[PDB]
């Protein structure tokens, strides 16, 4: 098939009689034989450019400081919070008493109950740190 003659960085338009044409600026083709140059990803707002796009590779983003990546290729950004907090639709909210979060992301989780395994409390828990159990 003639379109296989077009390497990455070019495209084989099935219109205009399948000629290899170079990818216009701000577009790319990461593989040969493509029928169109894909639009280069743009990192705006919560997203930040990690690598600019070339004729043969898409641009890559990470998250602006204060946000963290989720999904393959950092396809999503989620807002950070501080330790002792969790993210809600209304913003960062402090952990409930008896729960904690030791990360800048994720949800709070309850303190370990030492008694349930015949253990005692060596260090009381905080909103940032779990209870420490001893024998």
């Amino acid at each position, epitope marked *: 098939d003639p379109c296989s003659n077009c390497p990455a960085g070019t495209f084989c338009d099935n219109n205009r009689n399948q000629i290899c044409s170079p990818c216009p600026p701000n577009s790319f083709s990461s593989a040969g034989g493509q029928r169109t140059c894909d639009i280069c990803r743009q990192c705006k707002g919560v997203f930040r450019t990690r690598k600019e796009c070339s004729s043969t590779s898409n641009a890559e983003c990470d998250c602006t400081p204060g946000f963290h990546c989720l999904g393959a290729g950092c396809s999503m950004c989620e807002q950070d919070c501080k330790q002792g907090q969790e993210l809600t639709k209304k913003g960062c909210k402090d952990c409930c008493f008896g729960t904690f979060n030791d990360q800048k992301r994720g*949800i709070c*989780r309850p303190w370990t109950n030492c008694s349930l395994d015949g253990k005692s409390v060596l260090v009381n828990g905080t909103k940032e740190r779990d209870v420490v159990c001893g024998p």
Partner: antibody
Amino acid sequence: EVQLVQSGAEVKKPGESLRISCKGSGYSFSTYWISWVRQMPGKGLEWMGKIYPGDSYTNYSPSFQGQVTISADKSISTAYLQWSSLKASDTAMYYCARGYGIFDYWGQGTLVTVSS
Amino acid sequence: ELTQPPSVSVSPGQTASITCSGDNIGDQYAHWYQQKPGQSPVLVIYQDKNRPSGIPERFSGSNSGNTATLTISGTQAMDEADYYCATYTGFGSLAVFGGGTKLTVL
């Protein structure tokens, strides 16, 4: 790349116990929740529960509380879902996923067929 | 409980609207997953309206009151799939999937 790889298909009889697994790779396994999701044939997704593998804290949805056990071995970046006694109605696809409300990675699924 | 219509059908190019209703679901973040036959679910909308990069821009979402809505403008045959809404509730730390909607395209 980040990957969640689940164990292969299982064929069991009612009354047998079973544990299936989900191995995460390419990221810090101890610091992301692992959720387990059931999908009976032709039915919808059902959240069963989740585990924080760093300290193995687990919680379950009310309809699966006491019916299954979720566990983890963080030294091998593996999460587990286990039954003490399977029923024929447990026949389903079971997915592991990373997260607690946003599931940004999914395993390929494990088919469990329970037939007398 | 999150309730979805079991079926939505459209012709190619028509707008597909998939609802997910729950009491005060507008107070939560709603996320939308797409699942094709034989495949694992894929997140197409997160935090009610945000689309992951790589998802076709014809996918959009909204959430207010007791209803969250996934909208596909100019629906294509490749969009035929099962669609599931999901929310997380901090009161009990539970995730809940809607019952699912099978989108068929003529």
